[PDB]
Write an enzyme that holds these catalytic residues in place. Structure first.
Site, short mmCIF file in Angstrom:
data_model
loop_
_atom_site.label_atom_id
_atom_site.label_comp_id
_atom_site.label_asym_id
_atom_site.label_seq_id
_atom_site.Cartn_x
_atom_site.Cartn_y
_atom_site.Cartn_z
N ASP A 1 41.29 60.04 59.10
CA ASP A 1 42.19 58.93 59.38
C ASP A 1 41.44 57.63 59.58
O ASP A 1 40.93 57.31 60.65
CB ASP A 1 43.03 59.26 60.63
N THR A 2 41.37 56.84 58.50
CA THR A 2 40.71 55.55 58.56
C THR A 2 41.44 54.59 59.50
O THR A 2 40.85 53.59 59.92
CB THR A 2 40.55 54.93 57.18
N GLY A 3 42.68 54.90 59.86
CA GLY A 3 43.44 54.13 60.80
C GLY A 3 43.27 54.54 62.24
O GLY A 3 43.97 54.00 63.12
#
Ligand SMILES: *O[C@H](C)[C@H](NC(C)=O)C(=O)N[C@H](C(=O)N[C@@H](CCCC)CN[C@@H](CCCC)C(=O)N[C@@H](CCC(N)=O)C(=O)N[C@@H](CCCNC(N)=[NH2+])C(N)=O)[C@@H](C)CC
Ligand SMILES: [Cl-]
Ligand SMILES: [Cl-]
Ligand SMILES: [Cl-]
Ligand code: NA
Lengths: 99, 99
Positions: free
Chosen positions: A25-27
């Site tokens: 999850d780059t977020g």
């Protein structure tokens, strides 16, 4: 690997001697794992996102293997609906977004 | 580009003629933006995150530029803490995660 995004980017991780599935999850600033035992001292944290906040325990200097790549860093443990590998460990395995 | 993850992967988007900031988020199925006006009819959708569920407005075939790349697709509008570009649009701009 090169991971396309047609499906959720799920990988196998090894943490605390346990194999788990987790979402890359780059977020996510931080890595958050469902309830489990980890060694050492911890401190509480509240973390938020869609739907609001949950309370977690913060453990530092945890070794993890992510799709075969070893990293070390802070791991948050608590009632997350999904195990998430966040940026603090994605950087260590050299993950980048490319387009 | 090649975007590393030492900082949040924030990019400029353009939607409705307006520039906004949003997070490139491999851990998001969908694209969710803070309250704004969009044309046409919307449909209901429930989405989940780390804290639980929220109701959003689903608009389809919305024109949106992401870091200078043109996309046309579904945008969800509602009480997200941050604007997020999810996989529905990341696939349109040809984004991959690589390590
Ligand atoms: O903590 C820092 C400051 C930051 N918090 C805030 C408020 O900015 C943060 O990094 N928060 C993390 C986080 O939740 N990041 C999200 C983006 C930024 C906040 C909105 C993205 N996280 C993912 C995965 C969360 C898993 C628990 C996420 O929210 N994905 C959603 C997005 C909504 C959507 N429809 O795309 C998602 O994909 N939801 C779908 C359901 C997925 C269900 N999967 C399973 N297996 N049941 C959906 N269709 O609704 C957190 C993680 C703290 C570090
Ligand atoms: Cl860390
Ligand atoms: Cl680097
Ligand atoms: Cl779409
Ligand atoms: Na520790």
């Amino acid at each position: 690997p090169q991971i396309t995004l047609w499906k959720r980017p799920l990988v196998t991780i090894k943490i605390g001697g346990q194999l788990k599935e987790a979402l890359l999850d780059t977020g996510a600033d931080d890595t958050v794992i469902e309830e489990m035992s980890l060694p050492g001292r911890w401190k509480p944290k509240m973390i938020g996102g869609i739907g609001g906040f949950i309370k977690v325990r913060q453990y530092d200097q945890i070794i993890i293997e992510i799709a075969g790549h070893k990293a070390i860093g802070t791991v948050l443990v608590g009632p997350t609906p999904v195990n998430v590998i966040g940026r603090n460990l994605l950087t260590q395995i050299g993950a980048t977004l490319n387009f």
